[PDB]
Amino acid sequence: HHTDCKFIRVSGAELVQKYIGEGSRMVRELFVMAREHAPSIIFMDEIDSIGSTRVEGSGGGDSEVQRTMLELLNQLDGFETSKNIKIIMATNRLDILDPAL
Amino acid sequence: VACVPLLPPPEDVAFLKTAYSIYLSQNELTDAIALAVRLGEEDMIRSVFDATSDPVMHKQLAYILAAQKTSFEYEGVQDIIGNGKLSEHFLYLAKELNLTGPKVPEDIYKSHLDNSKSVFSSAGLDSAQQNLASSFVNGFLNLGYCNDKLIVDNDNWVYKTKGDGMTSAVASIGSIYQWNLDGLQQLDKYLYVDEPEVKAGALLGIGISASGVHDGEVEPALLLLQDYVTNPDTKISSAAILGLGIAFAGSKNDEVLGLLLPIAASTDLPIETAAMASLALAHVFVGTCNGDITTSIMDNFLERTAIELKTDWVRFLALALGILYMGQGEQVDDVLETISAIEHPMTSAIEVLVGSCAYTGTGDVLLIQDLLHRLTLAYAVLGIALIALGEDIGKEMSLRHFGHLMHYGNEHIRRMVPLAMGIVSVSDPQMKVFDTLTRFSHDADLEVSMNSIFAMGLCGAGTNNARLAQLLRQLASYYSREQDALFITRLAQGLLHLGKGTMTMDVFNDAHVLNKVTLASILTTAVGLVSPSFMLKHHQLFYMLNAGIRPKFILALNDEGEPIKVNVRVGQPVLLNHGERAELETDEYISYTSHIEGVVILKKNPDYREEE
Amino acid sequence: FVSNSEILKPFEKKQEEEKKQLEEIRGNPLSIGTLEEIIDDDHAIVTSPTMPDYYVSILSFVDKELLEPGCSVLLHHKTMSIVGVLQDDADPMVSVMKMDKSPTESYSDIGGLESQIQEIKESVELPLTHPELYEEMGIKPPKGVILYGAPGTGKTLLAKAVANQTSATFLRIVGSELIQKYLGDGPRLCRQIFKVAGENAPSIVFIDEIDAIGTKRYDSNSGGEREIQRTMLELLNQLDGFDDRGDVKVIMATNKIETLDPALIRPGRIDRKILFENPDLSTKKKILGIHTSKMNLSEDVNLETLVTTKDDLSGADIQAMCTEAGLLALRERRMQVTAEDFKQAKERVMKNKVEENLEGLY
Amino acid sequence: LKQTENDLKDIEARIKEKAGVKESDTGLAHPLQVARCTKIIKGEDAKYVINLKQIAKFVVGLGERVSPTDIEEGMRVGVDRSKYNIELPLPPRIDPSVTMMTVEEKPDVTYSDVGGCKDQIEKLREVVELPLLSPERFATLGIDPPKGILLYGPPGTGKTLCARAVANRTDATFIRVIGSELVQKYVGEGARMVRELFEMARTKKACIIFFDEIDAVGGARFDDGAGGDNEVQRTMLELITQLDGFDPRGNIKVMFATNRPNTLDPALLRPGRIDRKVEFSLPDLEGRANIFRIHSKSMSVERGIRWELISRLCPNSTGAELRSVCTEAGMFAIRARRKVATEKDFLKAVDKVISGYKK
Numbered sequence A: 001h002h003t004d005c006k007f008i009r010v011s012g013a014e015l016v017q018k019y020i021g022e023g024s025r026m027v028r029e030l031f032v033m034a035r036e037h038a039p040s041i042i043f044m045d046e047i048d049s050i051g052s053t054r055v056e057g058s059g060g061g062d063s064e065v066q067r068t069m070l071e072l073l074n075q076l077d078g079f080e081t082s083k084n085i086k087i088i089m090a091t092n093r094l095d096i097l098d099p100a101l
Numbered sequence B: 001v002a003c004v005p006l007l008p009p010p011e012d013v014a015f016l017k018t019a020y021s022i023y024l025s026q027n028e029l030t031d032a033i034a035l036a037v038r039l040g041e042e043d044m045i046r047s048v049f050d051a052t053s054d055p056v057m058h059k060q061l062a063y064i065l066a067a068q069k070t071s072f073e074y075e076g077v078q079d080i081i082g083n084g085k086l087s088e089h090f091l092y093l094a095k096e097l098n099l100t101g102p103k104v105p106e107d108i109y110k111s112h113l114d115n116s117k118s119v120f121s122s123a124g125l126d127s128a129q130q131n132l133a134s135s136f137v138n139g140f141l142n143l144g145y146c147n148d149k150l151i152v153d154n155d156n157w158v159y160k161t162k163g164d165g166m167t168s169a170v171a172s173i174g175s176i177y178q179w180n181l182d183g184l185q186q187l188d189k190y191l192y193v194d195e196p197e198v199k200a201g202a203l204l205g206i207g208i209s210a211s212g213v214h215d216g217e218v219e220p221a222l223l224l225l226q227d228y229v230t231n232p233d234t235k236i237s238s239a240a241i242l243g244l245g246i247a248f249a250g251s252k253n254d255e256v257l258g259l260l261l262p263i264a265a266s267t268d269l270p271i272e273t274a275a276m277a278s279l280a281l282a283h284v285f286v287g288t289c290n291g292d293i294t295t296s297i298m299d300n301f302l303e304r305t306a307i308e309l310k311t312d313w314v315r316f317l318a319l320a321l322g323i324l325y326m327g328q329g330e331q332v333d334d335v336l337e338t339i340s341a342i343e344h345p346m347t348s349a350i351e352v353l354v355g356s357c358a359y360t361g362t363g364d365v366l367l368i369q370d371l372l373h374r375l376t377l378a379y380a381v382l383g384i385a386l387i388a389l390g391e392d393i394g395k396e397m398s399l400r401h402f403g404h405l406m407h408y409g410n411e412h413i414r415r416m417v418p419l420a421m422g423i424v425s426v427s428d429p430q431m432k433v434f435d436t437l438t439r440f441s442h443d444a445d446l447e448v449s450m451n452s453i454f455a456m457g458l459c460g461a462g463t464n465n466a467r468l469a470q471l472l473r474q475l476a477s478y479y480s481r482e483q484d485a486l487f488i489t490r491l492a493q494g495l496l497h498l499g500k501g502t503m504t505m506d507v508f509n510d511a512h513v514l515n516k517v518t519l520a521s522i523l524t525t526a527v528g529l530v531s532p533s534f535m536l537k538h539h540q541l542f543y544m545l546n547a548g549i550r551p552k553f554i555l556a557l558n559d560e561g562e563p564i565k566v567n568v569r570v571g572q573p574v575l576l577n578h579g580e581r582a583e584l585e586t587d588e589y590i591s592y593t594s595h596i597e598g599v600v601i602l603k604k605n606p607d608y609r610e611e612e
Numbered sequence C: 001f002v003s004n005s006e007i008l009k010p011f012e013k014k015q016e017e018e019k020k021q022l023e024e025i026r027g028n029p030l031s032i033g034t035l036e037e038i039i040d041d042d043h044a045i046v047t048s049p050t051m052p053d054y055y056v057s058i059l060s061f062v063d064k065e066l067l068e069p070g071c072s073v074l075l076h077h078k079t080m081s082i083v084g085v086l087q088d089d090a091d092p093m094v095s096v097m098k099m100d101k102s103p104t105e106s107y108s109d110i111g112g113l114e115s116q117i118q119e120i121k122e123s124v125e126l127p128l129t130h131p132e133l134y135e136e137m138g139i140k141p142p143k144g145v146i147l148y149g150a151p152g153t154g155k156t157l158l159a160k161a162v163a164n165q166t167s168a169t170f171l172r173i174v175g176s177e178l179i180q181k182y183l184g185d186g187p188r189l190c191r192q193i194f195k196v197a198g199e200n201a202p203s204i205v206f207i208d209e210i211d212a213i214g215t216k217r218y219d220s221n222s223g224g225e226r227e228i229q230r231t232m233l234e235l236l237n238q239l240d241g242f243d244d245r246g247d248v249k250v251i252m253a254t255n256k257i258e259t260l261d262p263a264l265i266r267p268g269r270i271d272r273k274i275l276f277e278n279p280d281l282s283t284k285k286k287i288l289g290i291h292t293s294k295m296n297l298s299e300d301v302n303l304e305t306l307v308t309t310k311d312d313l314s315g316a317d318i319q320a321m322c323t324e325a326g327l328l329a330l331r332e333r334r335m336q337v338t339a340e341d342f343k344q345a346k347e348r349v350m351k352n353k354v355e356e357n358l359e360g361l362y
Numbered sequence D: 001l002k003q004t005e006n007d008l009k010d011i012e013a014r015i016k017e018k019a020g021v022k023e024s025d026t027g028l029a030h031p032l033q034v035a036r037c038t039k040i041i042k043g044e045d046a047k048y049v050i051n052l053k054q055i056a057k058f059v060v061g062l063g064e065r066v067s068p069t070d071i072e073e074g075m076r077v078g079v080d081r082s083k084y085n086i087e088l089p090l091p092p093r094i095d096p097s098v099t100m101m102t103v104e105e106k107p108d109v110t111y112s113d114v115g116g117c118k119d120q121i122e123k124l125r126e127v128v129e130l131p132l133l134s135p136e137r138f139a140t141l142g143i144d145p146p147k148g149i150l151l152y153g154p155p156g157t158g159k160t161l162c163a164r165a166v167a168n169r170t171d172a173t174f175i176r177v178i179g180s181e182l183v184q185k186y187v188g189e190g191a192r193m194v195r196e197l198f199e200m201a202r203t204k205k206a207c208i209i210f211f212d213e214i215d216a217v218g219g220a221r222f223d224d225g226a227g228g229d230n231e232v233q234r235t236m237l238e239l240i241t242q243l244d245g246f247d248p249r250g251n252i253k254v255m256f257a258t259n260r261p262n263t264l265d266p267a268l269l270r271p272g273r274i275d276r277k278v279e280f281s282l283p284d285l286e287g288r289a290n291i292f293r294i295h296s297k298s299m300s301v302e303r304g305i306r307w308e309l310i311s312r313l314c315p316n317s318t319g320a321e322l323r324s325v326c327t328e329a330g331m332f333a334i335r336a337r338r339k340v341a342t343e344k345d346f347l348k349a350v351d352k353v354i355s356g357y358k359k
Helices: A022-036 A064-080 B014-025 B029-039 B042-051 B055-066 B080-084 B094-100 B104-116 B128-141 B149-153 B155-159 B164-177 B183-191 B196-209 B221-230 B237-247 B254-264 B278-284 B291-303 B311-324 B329-341 B345-359 B365-375 B378-388 B392-407 B411-424 B431-440 B446-459 B468-476 B483-496 B516-526 B540-548 C002-026 C114-129 C131-137 C155-166 C185-199 C226-241 C281-293 C303-309 C315-331 C339-353 D002-025 D118-133 D135-141 D159-170 D189-203 D231-244 D285-295 D307-313 D319-335 D343-357
Strands: A006-011 A040-045 A085-088 B555-557 B599-601 C031-037 C045-047 C072-075 C082-085 C098-101 C144-147 C169-174 C203-208 C248-253 C270-274 D102-105 D148-151 D173-178 D207-212 D252-257 D276-278
Touching: A006 A022, A022 A064, A040 A064, A064 A085, A064 C098, A064 C169, B014 B029, B014 B042, B029 B042, B029 B055, B042 B055, B042 B080, B055 B094, B055 B599, B080 B094, B094 B104, B128 B149, B128 B164, B128 B483, B149 B155, B149 B164, B155 B164, B164 B183, B164 B196, B164 B237, B164 B540, B183 B196, B196 B221, B196 B237, B196 B540, B221 B237, B221 B254, B237 B254, B237 B278, B237 B540, B254 B278, B254 B291, B278 B291, B278 B311, B278 B516, B291 B311, B291 B329, B311 B345, B311 B516, B329 B345, B345 B365, B345 B378, B365 B378, B365 B392, B365 C002, B378 B392, B378 B411, B378 B516, B392 B411, B392 B431, B392 C002, B392 D002, B411 B431, B411 B446, B411 B516, B431 B446, B431 D002, B446 B468, B446 B483, B446 B516, B468 B483, B516 B540, C002 C082, C002 D002, C114 C131, C114 C144, C114 C155, C114 C248, C114 C270, C114 D319, C144 C155, C155 C169, C155 C203, C155 C248, C169 C185, C185 C203, C185 C226, C226 D173, C226 D207, C270 D319, C270 D343, C281 C303, C281 C315, C303 C339, C315 C339, D118 D135, D118 D148, D118 D159, D118 D252, D118 D276, D148 D159, D159 D173, D159 D207, D159 D252, D189 D207, D189 D231, D189 D252, D285 D307, D285 D319, D307 D343, D319 D343
Parallel strands: A006 A040, A040 A085, B555 B599, C144 C248, C144 C270, C169 C203, C203 C248, D148 D252, D148 D276, D173 D207, D207 D252
Antiparallel strands: C031 C045, C031 C072, C072 C082, C098 C169, D102 D173
């Protein structure tokens, strides 16, 4: 609200479609949306629980999706050297994290 | 000097001649020679050698001059050293005369090849038609080094093709012998006796062999040819004549003119398909004008008689005026007045060509507009190539000009354009030019397809199979609809991997100036390659493409044969030694004054003397 | 110029007349559909959404070889004739791929990796520099290399540098997203990645952290999860079964190269196996010098001093230090950085990395 | 310029095509999965209307006939998924349908390993090359050759090369299927795909179906269905059904490739499906020399080189590895900025590559 941007909560699993790429596609599209809407907060929803929110992260697609986001961040400081869209992670558990992360 | 013919209208040659004096001051004779070819200053080249009085410099100049051929093969430019070694006044050297009457450049071409190597071939196959293709290609693939033993060995390999095909097969032994003085000896044994196709074809093989080692011969082909002419053999003498014409290229002498001239006035064109010998005179007296040749050509053009209705000589006599007038720019205007005056439909074609040839490598506004008038025929469009290849902007101008030929659908129109692509792009392959050429392949006219594959062979030159492999497979898939196509495709491979794949046809030089000879070679082969291409002729004309050949090389020398290292960064070997091949790169250490590619004497500060 | 004009005057009249004869066909409504297959009688079968399917002869704007089975095409609204080719719609599904044209990074910025930089240069870089050169020689240089260390310390960086030099498209492939929980699904996702790589050559294909789709096991298929095994065999078949000269180069990444099947490594594609050395004192100086060129700082900061007291820090820790000392300056509202900021910064990252468990020593 | 030529080619086709096209419009216009003639103008029962779609069903219960004067109205006369059975106008029986495959008519690949794969070549020649080149020989013996052959051991060490090579040599279509793509979760999506491939094979017969990986398609389990090893088992079982049924053994070859035949079900292994099972041999010293000799028809190696001597210091290697050494040795030549190669460049490359390999 202070930095003057849309707060975008993204549900990790909802970016878990059972078809070819369509899912992989959604992941890519999202980055496209938030690049257009720059600046933006991407808040990675579903590696936390507010009580009314299901799934705190899992061995499926929440930790892997959390790796993907990091990759994107590397690439921006790369070719374009423009970066105005920041990702905020929230977690309660150190079992979703690994030291290179 | 680069700017004057590059950027503006380039009419005035005041600038060029003036630059030449400034070059004397600071002792860049290397740039002074480069100006001196093109303008047609025979005088300058000799005068710069006279100013030189340093042996280091003397031998280094002789090497970089060798590259522009026409002023090295030509007498009293090589023999400035020969006149003045006899009694000293110029400190001309003995080892140096062995450079100027070429032996040692050709020896290091061999040395390079033995050292960094390239593969052998055989393959004669069988059937007459296949044999001739395979025989021709063999000689091209092992050109520039004697490996003719295989051909000689199988007498049946030799035998199988007949008539004028036997003339070629025998003669291919000559292609393998080319650039090598020793190889003349070996040839003699086949020459004597044999079948008459063997006899005749030897003489053609001697003319191919001598192309680039005629200048200071060891076997006198003129004497063998002279004898032959008095002998019956109306037909054979023609091909004999093409070979000696090829042999006598670059130089000029009265002797060759005397043998050729009466043969040209025979009129044995209608029946034998002989009397081509004006073409041969044209090729000997390149870049220079002798009036006897000119008048002969002109009056036989005016005739148009029942004998001279034979359309083959007309293609050659067309070409002939332009080759005699290549490079001489302004002075040619005298010849042009005579030409314009003798009105014919044949002649209008020849106007644009003479002007193209003469202005070659620098186009002008007059020339572009004049060629567009003609267009709205083959010679006007082919001329565009000659002007475009010296010019950066002119290469881009090509895509615009050849647009026109593409917007028409007419079959004639389609067929002409691929030769013109072939002539410009000879130096290095141009991929945008290849995208256009693919389309020209797949047409419902056979003759367009034939010229496209001869064009791909021209354009790919200086390099082997790049994108070309994938094209070379598609060409192969058209043998099944067309007999001609196999032969032409076989020729393309031979050209693409000519002289063991490391030799080129190019307008880049050890002095970075276009070579008048190389241009004429390509031009004359482009119209009239093989019997069903154009007007009925001979397959035999293909050997004329030999004139085109320059080998790629940088050899650094610290002395005269001692090695000195350089590293240069070719295909990925990358970071090669001296004594190898490179293109568009130069030495990383300092020449006497030249700092240029080719056979170079390199010098070091004695404090940080390095030698390999 | 003059050339344009010669052409304009006949070209005009023919163009209008052709443009017209096309537009009478092309007139609306014409439905889009997709070309199923091209039959060899020079017909073609087309799949329409609205349920005509017909065998029709082409009409030009394209040629029969300018079309392939499965292409999108324009269809007539009663005979379903192929008037022209069109470009896919209603969402082409393309798999996660990140495009980086000339990613801004060089060898110079990360110098002191000297030994690795030559290895990647010979194998990857110089073949891409020589395109017609790889076509003529025909023999394989290295197709592919493997880089193994820690990401964003050399592994990410090295591949970014070489991409900048050769003007190749750099393609960052998320190892894990290929880890879809379905069947059939992993290999067709993997295949799609390779399809696009060959189409849009030149490119370097950087496949980030393959171990989630991998895991070697003891058998080449096992009664555990099938999806993880499926993606792995497709990946092994994709190196083994199509080979390139120079048109596509593969850089593979993994933290541990020993969790990969030894036949998925496969010599004769991946010839180079590149590993990570630790910084010595002199490298620490070099890596530090670059990072401070881009800072502004106080002149009481001494590089030599910081370096000596650092021992066993990799470059990642060196980068973190620049940001942490610089953060205390940003807190004090200052765009210099003092000596003091660095000392506290050096000490802290040093402490956390350098955890003791008495496993050193001996 | 490039755009103008390309347009003039289309335009030249377009005028001629438009004329033929108008005429063809007047009555409308071999691969299919359901039959279509969209009404049938032409012709108890004595006229035949076939349109098999879900929307619009014209169901004839009588087949038997050439009647309309051949194919018409949407041209796809052929085979139904409801049995209307348009029998034999322009004979349309057994088709490709819609398949997804990678076809290479006459591969550009020839053997480059003959030293460890001397054995795979001797068997190959006899099973595939000679029955296609002379069928009559086999006939006089009273035998028909193998339907399927399995080649095992490490992939790509000349195993893959032998497959492509025999296809080129016989003038048969080479079809690479990756086995792992023909296995689907989706109900049957997997079984259906398998029927269409063998039918495709039948239409186009005298052809080699190369299956990379049967570890995927079968392979180990203990679960015996599980909601994900059922799906796999259904694909495996359908594949068997085509082989062990009716198939041509003298036209259709299937060559299978695996990395371990010991976790494969006995039904994949057994004759009735795979007759010959050929072993990969890590090459012997003499073997290494011939495969070396092939690569060293390039490179300016020293002349008088003894590959046998180099082979005796080498650890174990596979054909993939021997090629691998040769190109890495050329990397040392460019690295040191020198034209020619020695024995030494090859030794140095061995030393490196084997350690790198290990696990």
